């Protein structure tokens, strides 16, 4: 009847396509779905959940709660960072294992703003001030508190607020960061002042760190790799 | 379902065709493009750019700046042309290597108006008059200044304007000139008067020549040949 011409591309299965397929149970009525609470509509809405960053990946400390706290102490008051942290959400083992990172693993380009958090979880009576600094990419992580105070940085008073939060900003020439290897910036924490305390209270506080995506974050070009 | 008949031509790949093909990344969002300045929309908009004509293709002078100037001198005042030039944009090595020519190379018929230019680039104090003549096709290039003055020709005073421009007109019976071999016309330059000068200023001026297409120019039936 109607004259037609099959062009090239006919009879090839193309995984990456979708066309109305004939259904194998056309009579069968499907069970209606219910309003189960907690429907996810977009992967980003998981990247948006602040999760813990394994700061210590020392064979010993890893694979146990210990890989998540930072032993804020009161030992010789050195001048290096308390914990430096490169913001290559994918190019860094520390950040790689996070949830954010887990979703990033399934994509090649992603580009947004990471927001971090540092919940202090030491004595209620303990008190001090730590300097948290954002070394922007291209540069070098600061090694002295001084250098870091010159840069951007919060001066977070332990005693006043148990948690310093802070959204690092989005940047990239190539307006989509590549997950693979090589920049991204850093985040360090400096003892600004020692963590002074009243009575026998231990001189061993700890700090937890979070990370997540902000609304501006997004990913593109999916790429699963998981195999065996 | 709908009865159909596959006519001849089905299942043949025809390089020269275009049909909506199934896309391999239907989910993938493409990077939006920016307003990069200098977008070209049509090849002609390159043919429209006056470029330099290698007047001398002598093995020696060629493949170096020297293949582009004309040694206007003050030696025995001969009566031949200073530089004759056949306007076969493709059938002539001199004009072949130009940009115009480069685009012409990718087509069989083209048909418009070439506009030439002769920028004199000798002393500011130097002065003279050269006769530039358009011998139309079919005829023979003029060999004496006299014959050329009878034809069409500008009398371009060096001293008054450093550059004689002049659009040669479009002609052809076969209202599309064929790039291959055999007419097209000529363009000669005659010393009209010697190039007189004041003091030790050298008696060696030079002249540059340009060529390009005018709005009426166009090409048709593409034909790439480049191989190895």
């Amino acid at each position: 009847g109607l004259p037609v011409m099959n062009t090239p591309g006919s009879n090839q299965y193309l995984t990456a396509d979708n066309f109305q397929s004939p259904c194998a149970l056309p009579e069968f009525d499907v069970t209606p779905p219910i309003d189960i609470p907690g429907e996810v509509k977009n992967m980003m809405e998981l990247a948006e959940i602040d999760t813990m960053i394994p700061f210590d990946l020392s064979a010993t400390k890893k694979n146990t709660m210990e890989m998540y706290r930072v032993r804020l102490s009161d030992k010789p008051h050195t001048d290096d960072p308390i914990l430096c942290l490169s913001l290559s959400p994918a190019s860094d083992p520390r950040l790689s294992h996070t949830m954010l990172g887990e979703i990033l693993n399934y994509y090649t380009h992603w580009a947004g703003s990471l927001k971090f958090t540092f919940l202090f979880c030491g004595s209620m009576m303990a008190t001090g001030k730590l300097l948290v600094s954002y070394a922007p990419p291209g540069a070098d992580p600061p090694k002295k508190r001084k250098e870091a105070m010159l840069g951007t940085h919060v001066i977070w008073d332990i005693g006043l607020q148990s948690s310093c939060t802070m959204v690092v900003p989005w940047i990239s020439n190539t307006t989509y960061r590549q997950t693979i290897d090589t920049e991204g910036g850093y985040i360090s924490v400096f003892y600004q002042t020692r963590i002074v305390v009243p009575l026998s209270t231990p001189r061993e506080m700890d700090i937890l760190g979070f990370v997540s995506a902000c609304n501006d974050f997004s990913v593109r070009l999916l790429r699963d790799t998981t195999h065996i | 379902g709908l009865p159909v008949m596959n006519t001849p031509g089905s299942n043949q790949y025809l390089t020269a065709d275009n049909f909506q093909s199934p896309c391999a990344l239907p989910e993938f969002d493409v990077t939006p493009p920016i307003d990069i300045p200098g977008e070209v929309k049509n090849m002609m908009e390159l043919a429209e750019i006056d470029t330099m004509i290698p007047f001398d293709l002598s093995a020696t002078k060629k493949n170096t700046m020297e293949m582009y100037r004309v040694r206007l001198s003050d030696k025995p005042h001969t009566d031949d042309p200073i530089l004759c030039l056949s306007l076969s944009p493709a059938s002539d090595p001199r004009l072949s290597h130009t940009m115009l020519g480069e685009i012409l190379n990718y087509y069989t018929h083209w048909a418009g108006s070439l506009k030439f230019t002769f920028l004199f680039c000798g002393s500011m104090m130097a002065t003279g008059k050269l006769l530039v003549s358009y011998a139309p096709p079919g005829a023979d290039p003029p060999k004496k200044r006299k014959e050329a003055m009878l034809g069409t020709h500008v009398i371009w005073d060096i001293g008054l304007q450093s550059s004689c421009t002049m659009v040669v007109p479009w002609i052809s019976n076969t209202t599309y000139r064929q790039t291959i071999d055999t007419e097209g016309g000529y363009i000669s330059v005659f010393y009209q008067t010697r190039i007189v000068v004041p003091l030790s200023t050298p008696r060696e001026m030079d002249i540059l020549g340009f060529v390009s297409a005018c709005n009426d120019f166009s090409v048709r039936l593409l034909r790439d040949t480049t191989h190895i």
Partner: peptide, 7 residues
Amino acid sequence: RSRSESS
């Protein structure tokens, strides 16, 4: 930026 590719 858009979220589309990660719905």
